């Protein structure tokens, strides 16, 4: 059967700061440190 053609993908876009991750003393692997991010734009390319 015929199928529709995909077009006009819709993406809905605040840039969360990544400064704490790259700043300060990283804790040891047992003291694993993570930052939770929600509803924020990301720049993985910069990291």
């Amino acid at each position: 059967s015929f199928e529709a053609k995909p077009s006009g993908s819709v993406v809905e876009q605040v840039e969360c700061d990544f400064s704490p991750l790259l700043s300060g003393t990283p804790p040891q692997v047992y003291n694993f440190k993570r930052l939770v991010f929600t509803n924020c734009n990301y720049n993985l390319t910069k990291l």
Partner: protein, 50 residues
């Protein structure tokens, strides 16, 4: 999760806050609060049920 944040009447549970604690918690305590009041000030108090 707090019902009051979204619908108080519904009683449904919706997350209102995220706590960054990655430590396992094996124990908790409840109702350590107390009221400082004169005899006239004292009134019946509602309670919390776990």
């Amino acid at each position: 999760f707090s019902s009051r944040y979204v619908d108080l009447y519904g009683g449904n549970m919706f997350q209102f806050a995220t706590l960054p604690v990655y430590d396992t918690i094996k124990y908790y305590s409840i109702i350590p609060h107390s009221i400082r009041s004169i005899q006239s000030d004292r009134k019946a108090w509602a309670a919390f049920y776990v």
